[PDB]
Amino acid sequence: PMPPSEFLDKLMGKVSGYDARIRPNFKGPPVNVTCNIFINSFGSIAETTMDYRVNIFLRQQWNDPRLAYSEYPDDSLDLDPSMLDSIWKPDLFFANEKGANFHEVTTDNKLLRISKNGNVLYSIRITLVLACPMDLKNFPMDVQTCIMQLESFGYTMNDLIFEWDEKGAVQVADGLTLPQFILKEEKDLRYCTKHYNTGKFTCIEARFHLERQMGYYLIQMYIPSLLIVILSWVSFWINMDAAPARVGLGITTVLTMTTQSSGSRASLPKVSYVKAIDIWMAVCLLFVFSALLEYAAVNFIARQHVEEMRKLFISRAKRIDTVSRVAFPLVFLIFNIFYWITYKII
Amino acid sequence: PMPPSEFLDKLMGKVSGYDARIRPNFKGPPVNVTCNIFINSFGSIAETTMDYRVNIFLRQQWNDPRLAYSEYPDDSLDLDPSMLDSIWKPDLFFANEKGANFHEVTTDNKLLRISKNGNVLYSIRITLVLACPMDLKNFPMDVQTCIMQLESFGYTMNDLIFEWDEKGAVQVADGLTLPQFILKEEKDLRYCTKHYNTGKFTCIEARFHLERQMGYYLIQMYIPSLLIVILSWVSFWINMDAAPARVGLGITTVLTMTTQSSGSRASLPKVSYVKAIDIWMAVCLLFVFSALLEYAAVNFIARQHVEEMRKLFISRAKRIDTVSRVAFPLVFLIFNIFYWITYKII
Amino acid sequence: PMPPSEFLDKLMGKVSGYDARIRPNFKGPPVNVTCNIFINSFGSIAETTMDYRVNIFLRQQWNDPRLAYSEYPDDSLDLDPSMLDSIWKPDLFFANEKGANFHEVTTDNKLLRISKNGNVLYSIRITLVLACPMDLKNFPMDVQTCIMQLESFGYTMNDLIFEWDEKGAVQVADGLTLPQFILKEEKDLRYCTKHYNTGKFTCIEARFHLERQMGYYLIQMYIPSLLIVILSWVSFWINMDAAPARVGLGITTVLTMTTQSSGSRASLPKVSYVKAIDIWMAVCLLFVFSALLEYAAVNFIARQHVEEMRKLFISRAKRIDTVSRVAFPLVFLIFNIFYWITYKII
Amino acid sequence: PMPPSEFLDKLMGKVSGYDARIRPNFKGPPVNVTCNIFINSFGSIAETTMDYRVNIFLRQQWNDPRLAYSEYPDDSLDLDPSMLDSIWKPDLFFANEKGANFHEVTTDNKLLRISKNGNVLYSIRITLVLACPMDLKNFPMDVQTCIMQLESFGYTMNDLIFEWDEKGAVQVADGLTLPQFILKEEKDLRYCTKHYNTGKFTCIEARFHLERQMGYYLIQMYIPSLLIVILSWVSFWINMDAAPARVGLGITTVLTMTTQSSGSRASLPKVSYVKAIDIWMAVCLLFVFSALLEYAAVNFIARQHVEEMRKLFISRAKRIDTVSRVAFPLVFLIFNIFYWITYKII
Amino acid sequence: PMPPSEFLDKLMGKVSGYDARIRPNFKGPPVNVTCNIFINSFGSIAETTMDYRVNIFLRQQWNDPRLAYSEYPDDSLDLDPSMLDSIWKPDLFFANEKGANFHEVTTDNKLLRISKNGNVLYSIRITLVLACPMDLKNFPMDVQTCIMQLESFGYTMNDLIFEWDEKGAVQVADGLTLPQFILKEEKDLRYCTKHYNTGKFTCIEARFHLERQMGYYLIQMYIPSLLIVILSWVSFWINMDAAPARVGLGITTVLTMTTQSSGSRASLPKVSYVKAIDIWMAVCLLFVFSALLEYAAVNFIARQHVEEMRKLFISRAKRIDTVSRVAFPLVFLIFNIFYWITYKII
Numbered sequence A, B, C, D, E: 001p002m003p004p005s006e007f008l009d010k011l012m013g014k015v016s017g018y019d020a021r022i023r024p025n026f027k028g029p030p031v032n033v034t035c036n037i038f039i040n041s042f043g044s045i046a047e048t049t050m051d052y053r054v055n056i057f058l059r060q061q062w063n064d065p066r067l068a069y070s071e072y073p074d075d076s077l078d079l080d081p082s083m084l085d086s087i088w089k090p091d092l093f094f095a096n097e098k099g100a101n102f103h104e105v106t107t108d109n110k111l112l113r114i115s116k117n118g119n120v121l122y123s124i125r126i127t128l129v130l131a132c133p134m135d136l137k138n139f140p141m142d143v144q145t146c147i148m149q150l151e152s153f154g155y156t157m158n159d160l161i162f163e164w165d166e167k168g169a170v171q172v173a174d175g176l177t178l179p180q181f182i183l184k185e186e187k188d189l190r191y192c193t194k195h196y197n198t199g200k201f202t203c204i205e206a207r208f209h210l211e212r213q214m215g216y217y218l219i220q221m222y223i224p225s226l227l228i229v230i231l232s233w234v235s236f237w238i239n240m241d242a243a244p245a246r247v248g249l250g251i252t253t254v255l256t257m258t259t260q261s262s263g264s265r266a267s268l269p270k271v272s273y274v275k276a277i278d279i280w281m282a283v284c285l286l287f288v289f290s291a292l293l294e295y296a297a298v299n300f301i302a303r304q305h306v307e308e309m310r311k312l313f314i315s316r317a318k319r320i321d322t323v324s325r326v327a328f329p330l331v332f333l334i335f336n337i338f339y340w341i342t343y344k345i346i
């Protein structure tokens, strides 16, 4: 019995009229190529460039009546990547590649096996940096949706159709974890058939639903932002005579809030719409700014006040100081309730 | 009937006298190659390097009488990229490439179809990082103009001419959005015929009109810059006796403005001309600096003042403090009006 | 006697029925390829991307009865990399490559020698940037575990099996030092046999146990963080009359702690769980914040106090100031003991 | 008449004894290759790495008697880059490449035309990142000199000589602008013949004279640095009784100057020699530091002063305060004159 | 006479029994390849990654009796890089490459000349980014030692030996300058013969002795660090009554020192051992911290003091203030002497 390598010479060579530039079922129905990808290393989701690097295994299955054999006993011939370049392959590509490369560490990472009926399996390893438009209207409580479409370039709809398989469409690794986001078990599968001036091409896309973990931003940009507001609340228990103490407290705490507000947009795009973290840095900046105007009103009334007028303005400048100890801890409290509840049902 | 792959062997091979190193219509009129590009992924417009990464589909159409066939029934032969390297192709390149590469994810992204009359369509996917000179005289209210020219390298004007098609010259994707800029529907199409020491070559360019969204810079560099000026206005309601309070307020607020003025040029080139944001950081720095000189004049008059001279300087040092509460909120207001109106018609 | 180069022509050529696309022992037992790697340049372990660049020498040994010779006297034929591409090689790859390349400086860094019995040695140089999931629950006192698996891509378990050799499995260079971590002499060797929808493949992995050196973080984020707490302890020896002195001391030292707490996450991922350095920056921030509330209580009691009530509140506002000089230096001391002991046995 | 493509087969092929590995005029005079470059995209001049990226068109002209034809009517044959690799080309390279690549966007950007007398034109597009040693003794008022040399590698002086053409040696694009530097119209052309242990090789270099635009650094590091000195001058109009006001003014303004002095070396190499901007940040730091020692002398004399000694020290502590209002605004003024004049003739 | 190109066909072709896969002097003594490198562009020595980019010319000389000719008159045949790939070349590589590439700007930068006796010169251009372990025990006064070893990969000691030439081993360019380090004229040449599990290979290395220039760090991290200590010395000339002045001076100057101490490790690895700059930032931080405790002791004694006890504590609180004006300027002076002398002989 001749080995499978010499058997491919009589099937892939110039004999039998088999050419690698002809699609199967020519002058007939289009080729239905089913695909299923396996995610190996997901993560590294940048926000300034709005892209994410993923390493998937692209599997392609299509029927080819020209490769059907009957003399070989087994129904699986794991060939060599050398014969892989001498056959026909679908022109599958991604519309959001933005730079990609293969992996040829000691061997071109390609798979090729042919069944008796003509089934051809084609599995390779591709590293992609896919771009996805993100909506940052509520940045700390956003639901990301990273999509990836698989289009055709040379073959139109009447010559090649891409579809998803029924069982096991998108497999996920067991020990695949993410530091910031989380990968939900629900993945939508829809069509993305485009229409250009040349024609229409097939397209299959998968929608990965992600969600950020608030455990990181809560400690960096929320807990320190909440303590600065408390630093302005303590400015009311000090007597009005200590002018350099209360003025310096109302200024040193209002400028460090602007620094944290300006520094909270380091790893963020320059979007125009306001997000959920910008209003938090803005409203909390208003409370520490209102504390400055609070003492300014108390100081102006105290310095404006023979014995009948001064006996009432002192009681007025002190009464407003007692209300401020209950007003701001309650106005900021009702805002803290209306903030997390509004961003919990949207 | 022989397949189209074997038919190309009798048309692209050594037979019929067809060579891939000869342009169509040799020793006659030049080749008129019409082009139309489709934008897939636009964005990532850097400002320090003054470049932007774009992913376009370069389509080229040219007539070739040597490829006219009459035996094949259909008028479209979607060939393989293997035969694409055995024919003649225009030497189209960009004068502002600055690094570029193709996309060969599982298939070389090339398109080739030949009609009966000799029409040859050539569509590929090219990722370009194009450089464009930007005028930042008014950075927050600028109108960017990103151009891209398509020149010839080996064929002069009398051998190859590039032109734009009539219908559908520059197609834009439907879901193409930008975080900072906006892509207008008006795209100019002009010629850029260059003249070197070797000769003259064809050139076609498209002018993309962009515009920044002020919604981002208004919240980061304008709202905090406006609140610092208010921190200097509150220094007038405090009595002149509180020297460590008003001095510290006039210094802690004037130095944080310089930090924001120096930190507002992070993602900006080192241009010499002054922009619209530099004068805003400069004039607002003058207001918070004038508040320091305002108290310095009040403190100097108060410390200079038997009972006839001291009874008038106290009334003078207090009258100037009452005018400053109306002067600066009005001088800064008329400047705020003359600022946004001047940069709204230019 | 013919040279070994011409002898390979009669062994690797079309004669003798030897093809490079057939694995040894075909239609029989699988090939048992033993591997052992040598680490040349280890280090550069990034934390934001969670990867590390390593340069190893991949040695592969497998038997091949088709290469057994008997005419050559010696038992070692150091061939040329040209003949290396004309033989069969295992399809070894890594599941966490994330970009890799070879080294061809003046010569393709490949090794190939064939023994008389059929032993084939294959040594090459590969530069890998391997990703590893890290658990940062206790960042300054963590025990890293960098793993690297060697899987098969085209050959299943019944066709190719990877195993580790007995003596000298993972060799380490003599002068291999690390600036941050340390490489322990204990390296675990286990199996990682995966199961996909196509089939099962062999897998061998090595677990490198690393450990950070606390000598760096102790000086940057611990010693300065401990001195700031002492700056708040000195606020008790100052009299209560100095309001601008004690207030400014309690605010200038509590805001610089937040800056160090926010700046301590520069080269750190955005993980949600709290680490050992976040609680240190949080508890120490509570001590410098409690010093602010300490003086606020003393100032409020002093300003609230004919001669019977004022004679007791002054003694009360001074007694609490004497307890604070012993309380905080002891509450922070017992926390400093419970901190390093808890992170010394876990 | 045979086409020019088939005519090259009888001239570039094995016939006529023409080989691509033999230089013209063998066993005789050396080849005189004249070169002229065209600058397309200049700029991106980094300062930390001391390099600049340039995109030039390298044109090469040399005579070759083996390519002289007499049957073709025209005197220009624009060939294909395929025949370009089958002829002899000079081994021109740059001694300061530091990474380079070609441009093959849809066509290898190469030019090849042969005249009747034997003139061969060779124009290509090369992107170079050239390194140049810069002298930063006066950084804001420096005159940069970026050089680029074209050496030979395999052919010595007696086999190949590089020279510049007479008319149009270095052409510059019309719309070529720079954000920081300026390209002068004077470009020196000299020789750089090197002598190694192997032999001597030809070399041609061009000296591009650049000059920075002070309009950028004047607004960022000079105007804010001048206002801080004024903040220390206002410390003299305040009474000596305001100790927390004048001390805080002399310290908050002297520490922000050190921050600007340390932050003014971000995009700068770590050179040892002092530059023109370091002395400006040093002398201006001395003025704001002398203001601290000025009040320290006034405060020490005021606190040292039955009625005869105190009546003179108060007049002395006030007289020195009046001289400081004229001394420092004049000592800093004469330094400001001696600074810009010294760096205007050197 | 036949040209040298056609003469190589009778020497490098299949005739004469010359094969490119056989080393010279087979079945005999090993090949002694002498090497000498020329440094073109040295510098760019990173500290975080601990590597440096160098551009050297790798020259290799070895005897080959199979290339000896007698018919050609001259003794030098400068061949083409095409024939360079058809001969035998040593398998020279570097053990610390970490990414490398060649230079093929318009020509593969290779040199090949063969003498009559059989001497073969091989010169190429290689760009290397070499890693070197650095000892930063005394960072500002360190003596760097960058090494680079040239090992063999396929040929053992008994088949190929690398050695350095006698005259002109390591040539240095004339205009080669460095911004930070300096290249000494003393370069050690030793052997680095390694022993692996496969065998022993030749190795030659050169030790480049470097030294940093203190002129940069003296102005950025030493002069500003020395002025901050003077800001704490001036806190003694102010009266003890000015509590908000001396407290604010002792805190604003002690926190900016921590910022400079934390910011002095930007371009530095995360090593555990303490360096010479860390102790300078630590001891100087102790002086500005001792000034805070100095006033705390004076303030506590002043606030503790019918007329007999208060008449002595005031004289005691003032006497300690006079000693502090001589103590700290002398304790810091003797430390400044013991610092530069200790790091001048080690």
Ligand SMILES: *[C@@H]1O[C@H](CO)[C@@H](O[C@@H]2O[C@H](CO)[C@@H](O[C@@H]3O[C@H](CO)[C@@H](O)[C@H](O)[C@@H]3O)[C@H](O)[C@H]2NC(C)=O)[C@H](O)[C@H]1NC(C)=O
Pocket: A025, A029, A030, A031, A032, A161
């Ligand atoms: C690839 O999949 C498509 C469907 O997604 C297959 O096409 C449809 O194929 C049928 C033949 O099986 C075509 O004929 C029709 O048959 C149905 C009964 O199955 C009958 O009810 C209809 O009236 C019609 O006669 C049908 O036109 C075709 N439709 C389309 C839109 O293509 C296709 O055959 C598959 N290709 C291969 C190679 O299997």
Ligand SMILES: *[C@@H]1O[C@H](CO)[C@@H](O[C@@H]2O[C@H](CO)[C@@H](O[C@@H]3O[C@H](CO)[C@@H](O)[C@H](O)[C@@H]3O)[C@H](O)[C@H]2NC(C)=O)[C@H](O)[C@H]1NC(C)=O
Pocket: B025, B029, B030, B031, B032, B161
């Ligand atoms: C490519 O397009 C150019 C025009 O952009 C074509 O060229 C012009 O072509 C005409 C022939 O169609 C040349 O002849 C002239 O004909 C006109 C009538 O159409 C007549 O009024 C003139 O007096 C003249 O006889 C004309 O010289 C030529 N002009 C130029 C500037 O090239 C060209 O033919 C097109 N090429 C192909 C292959 O179609």
Ligand SMILES: *[C@@H]1O[C@H](CO)[C@@H](O[C@@H]2O[C@H](CO)[C@@H](O[C@@H]3O[C@H](CO)[C@@H](O)[C@H](O)[C@@H]3O)[C@H](O)[C@H]2NC(C)=O)[C@H](O)[C@H]1NC(C)=O
Pocket: C025, C029, C030, C031, C032, C161
């Ligand atoms: C590669 O290694 C495997 C083991 O890891 C070898 O396989 C085992 O090989 C034996 C033959 O040596 C097979 O037969 C059995 O022999 C044992 C005695 O050694 C006997 O007790 C059993 O009842 C059985 O008859 C055995 O089935 C096989 N097992 C597996 C799981 O593969 C294999 O032969 C090695 N390959 C080469 C080419 O050396």
Ligand SMILES: *[C@@H]1O[C@H](CO)[C@@H](O[C@@H]2O[C@H](CO)[C@@H](O[C@@H]3O[C@H](CO)[C@@H](O)[C@H](O)[C@@H]3O)[C@H](O)[C@H]2NC(C)=O)[C@H](O)[C@H]1NC(C)=O
Pocket: D025, D029, D030, D031, D032, D161
């Ligand atoms: C390339 O250019 C060089 C000059 O840069 C040419 O070389 C010089 O060429 C002349 C022949 O033209 C050699 O001969 C001499 O002729 C002059 C009159 O022109 C005569 O006064 C001298 O006494 C001598 O007989 C001369 O030796 C040579 N000099 C050098 C330094 O090379 C060269 O011919 C040019 N190559 C080609 C291929 O055109």
Ligand SMILES: *[C@@H]1O[C@H](CO)[C@@H](O[C@@H]2O[C@H](CO)[C@@H](O[C@@H]3O[C@H](CO)[C@@H](O)[C@H](O)[C@@H]3O)[C@H](O)[C@H]2NC(C)=O)[C@H](O)[C@H]1NC(C)=O
Pocket: E025, E029, E030, E031, E032, E161
């Ligand atoms: C490459 O260099 C080595 C030395 O580094 C050469 O090897 C030594 O070569 C000599 C022959 O010249 C061998 O023989 C001996 O000769 C000496 C007199 O020179 C004699 O005193 C000894 O008793 C012995 O007979 C010697 O064994 C050998 N040693 C080693 C360690 O290799 C070698 O010949 C050079 N290769 C070529 C191709 O020139």
